[PDB]
């Protein structure tokens, strides 16, 4: 069975960018609730139920039809939202492979941020964006509701691993920026976890 | 050019169901952004900026490739939240040939509100729950975003004539009841217009 991760700091630790009341009902409800329900699904699937949830999520077609997409959909969301909070982080700063690889691909750091704005702000609906490794180059994607780009491009429209990601689900900055999506992720980029980033972009798996 | 219709009713007019601070981000801030956008997408097309909004979205497939999404989008959100404003208001009973039909097609209205409220609550992410006439019939479907069932199967993957409709995106109901959306689901019994649903039932166009 999965468990809730607990947060790798206080939930009022990303404050004033992110606020507290969030990140609060975020992690003990809306991730908490994708953890009960993909529990529930697994409980009649022993084979899957021992597996880490990121390798879960990359064989979703090897799952009997009728639980296809309630795990897709709740160990979809365990997945981000784990990967979400690890993510996070203030003081950090982009530097070293990381800061090279993406002025590499995007020409300069400003124009892979201009980049990255546009594919949050333009995911209509529900969804994440993200920052992904492929081919052993970086490029920004966007996924609907709960799908990774782990779960391959036939399932989720997108493919690569991810470095860094942001959810533009309404509940992740409601409370604080109702509508206002933009401010929300231009404040984003003083709470990115860079060493998080680049500890993954090392690994590459 | 499409108009922001002003609300039938005070922000405030659906207290204590539906929170007064909500009504007026949704309506000013939303539905105008809808607004805007299907206006600019439609100032180079003329042929297709005369027609009605709820006309429009009949004929996406008739549109450039360009211009399908935008405004499938845009024009889509503009009608169903048009739809949505008059479909709300407090004091009305279920009652006529609306009740009887529905007492047909269900088996009771309590049959039937069950239906909905599972519909509406099992759509997940941005979405709308309808009630919809297919024909002669009534039917409970549900659309992703900001689709409607005017658009057909082909685009929504449902169809009909809708005939009432439950906004579920989480701006809807994140100020007043967070990720509670079951119990933003049955306050919305409440404020359910049955009058101008069973004018719609009656017109049947
Ligand atoms: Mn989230
Ligand atoms: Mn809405």
Known sequence: SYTLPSLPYAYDALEPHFDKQTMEI????????????????????????????????TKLDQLPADKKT??????GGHANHSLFWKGLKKGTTLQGDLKAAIERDFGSVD????????????????????????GDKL????????????????????????????????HAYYLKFQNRRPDYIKEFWNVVNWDEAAARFAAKK
């Open 111 to 134: 124009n892979f941020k201009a980049e990255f704005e546009k594919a949050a702000a333009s995911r209509f609906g529900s969804g994440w964006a993200w920052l992904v490794l492929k």
């Open 70 to 75: 309630v795990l897709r959909n709740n160990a």
């Open 139 to 170: 490029a920004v994607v966007s996924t609907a509701n709960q799908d990774s780009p782990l779960m391959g491009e036939a399932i989720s429209g997108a493919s690569g691993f991810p470095i860094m990601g942001l959810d533009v689900w309404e």
């Open 26 to 57: 975020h992690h003990t409800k809306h991730h908490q609730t994708f953890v009960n329900n993909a529990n529930a699904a697994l409980e009649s699937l022993p084979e899957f139920a021992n597996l880490p949830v990121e390798e879960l999520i």
